[PDB]
Amino acid sequence: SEESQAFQRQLTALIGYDVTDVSNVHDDELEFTRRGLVTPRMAEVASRDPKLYAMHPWVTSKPLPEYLWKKIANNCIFIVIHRSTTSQTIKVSPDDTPGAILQSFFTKMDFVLRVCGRDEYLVGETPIKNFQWVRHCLKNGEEIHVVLDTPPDPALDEVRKEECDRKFRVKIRGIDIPVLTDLTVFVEANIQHGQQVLCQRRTSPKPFTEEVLWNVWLEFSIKIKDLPKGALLNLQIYCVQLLYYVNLLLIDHRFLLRRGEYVLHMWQISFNADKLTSATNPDKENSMSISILLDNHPIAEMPNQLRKQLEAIIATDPLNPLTAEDKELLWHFRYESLKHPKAYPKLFSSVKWGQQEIVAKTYQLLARREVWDQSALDVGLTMQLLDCNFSDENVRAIAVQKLESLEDDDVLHYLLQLVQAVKFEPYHDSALARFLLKRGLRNKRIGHFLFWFLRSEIAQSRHYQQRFAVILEAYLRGCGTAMLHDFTQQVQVIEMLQKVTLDIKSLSAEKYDVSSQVISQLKQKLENLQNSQLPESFRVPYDPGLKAGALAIEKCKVMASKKKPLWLEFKCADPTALSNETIGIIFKHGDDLRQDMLILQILRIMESIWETESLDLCLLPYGCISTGDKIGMIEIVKDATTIAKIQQSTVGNTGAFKDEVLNHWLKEKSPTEEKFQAAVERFVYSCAGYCVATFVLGIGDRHNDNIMITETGNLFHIDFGHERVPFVLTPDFLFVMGTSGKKTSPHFQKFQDICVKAYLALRHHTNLLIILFSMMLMTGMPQLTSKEDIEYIRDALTVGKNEEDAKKYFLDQIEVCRDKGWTVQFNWFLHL
């Protein structure tokens, strides 16, 4: 049908890539995946409740933390209901449900309760203590305001109708680069499984000309019958240095042995998740290529010391290497290992995947999954089984099975790095992709962030754009017409605003200070865009509950920075919004904001870890979406400046520094002395939290220009673009603490206490943090050495040490900060 053709046009515009484009492929795996994803999409579409789906209540099953219980000593909670511009307060027990509040509301004086100024609803049979909006109002000491609205028409989510024993041999023909010190170049063929090179052959070294020819059969030691599914033929081009790489799945999505002629366009090197992609470089014009031929196809006692050695192995951290003896022990006593869910990553990383019968034994082992299936959900282990070291279908399938039991709250907590983990899938259609599709189609918020996460990569990396676009298209074909409309207008808005950001950046030279003519130009462009081209309103991508409307063109500016970010402020389209404050958005080009996304998501995961132990470090992981190559959006935190400007105002701008300035700023920006006390408390907590987080992630040695503070004392690092010091604990922070280099005021003692507590809390989830850090590096960083870079978070988390030594370690970090002072801060200016 032609309507379906226009609809595919629409989907392509939304995705930023055409999934029907068969130009850059050597098989039909992407199409097979588009076709296979139809079943789960339609299943979840038929299974989801229209009412709850449309109202998407953001709830949780976690208990209410201790610090938020300290805010409801009355066992009562006030809710301010607005029938129609007439507000009345109702007392509610934390256990009262939305329906209960209705049956009592009409007994104090069908419908639905919505959050004022937001597309959020308090619906469904959940104790209203478990509504995220209520927990937020409690955390920030705010009243819970609600509009009595009608249930959003469930019909608005309408969904359109869907419509043998032979050694493996590979002939290397040659390499061709259309245009390119010749030196020497050779080709290396690696049969790999999960980054584990099962075998390896090479060619002879030849001078590198724009065309090099071998026509040589490379025979590998592996028999064809031994090739495991998901095995990659990894072709690399060296010259000591690795110049090019590319990959081909030896077994396809049909269990068929790959066979025939292949001319693969390769990726150039500027370890790394990009080195695993099966996609070929779509730039057939400039990129190197290689020609290959495949002609080969149907798919009871245990001593004490040994059990102790085995448990020692099992107990070590995820980054602890496994000796050959360790692997042989794990494998010989594999049925004992199966009783310990934590031994699973190490047990399966001890499988000889290059042997067919060993893999069959491993599968028979996976059949004994009683202990694994009846074990509590350990996210660290699931992540470990989903990373780069596991290419087997069933191994990863068990991790996805464990993920299945997660609630939408935790799925949002881990969605970014699950999407990223999709990069470790050998095949486009995988249990992980299907699970992300399911959980996005089941919940509108998860689907919103899934759209934006998939699109951040689709429009930025050719390595995985095709796969992510297949998945995003599968999702869009089931999210519903309302969400398609929202996504369309969101994309249009962000594209206009990125146009403006780049066009303004062009108008300025290296000299930072922007001209007056450029202020005129920005005002002109914004007013021109506001009249007609800019839609009436749009959902804030990083906060899907907010609808932004008209531009406050008088408040829009551009920073006098090397990069020219745009500071835009919108009005809230929701007339029932309880305030008049503007929605702040920073549109920035020049930084890779995928790294910012990842660091922020790890920060949120750490906050949840701390909540599990009744701690609240008041971190502020502002919204942040990467929309394209070194371009994205950032949430504008209200009433926040930078420590740098707080120094510049009073101490001058010649690298000078004074210590009392922070406290004077907090007291002059504090209306009441009591609110200043509250601001100092918030400062201590947030500073401890950010010190701990920034040391754990190895990003603590920042410049005070990249550290901000709110007028209400809340501190927070920003711009994670990319003599040292473990973290930023400068003397101006200490003078707010109440210490003069040597003293130890009650607030500094509280700060040290909170630091040690949070640090040990993180050490409790050591494994999960290690795996998340490893995945973040592998999927979001430029280039990382597996040995050096990753193994920072082991020492940072002081692996293997008892809690006493870890406390002493973090306290000595604090003492290093105390000892150095402004050394690094001043050195930043010095090295101009």
Ligand SMILES: C[C@@H](NC(=O)c1c(N)nn2cccnc12)c1cc2cccc(C#Cc3cnn(C)c3)c2c(=O)n1-c1ccccc1
């Ligand atoms: C500090 C910096 N970023 C934030 O403030 C911020 C926030 N509010 N949330 N958030 C969340 C994550 C990361 N960053 C943030 C910031 C960005 C910026 C982005 C675009 C345009 C402009 C501007 C301007 C301007 C024009 N004429 N004149 C006099 C000033 C700016 C700007 O001025 N500053 C800034 C610098 C020092 C002191 C105070 C403000």
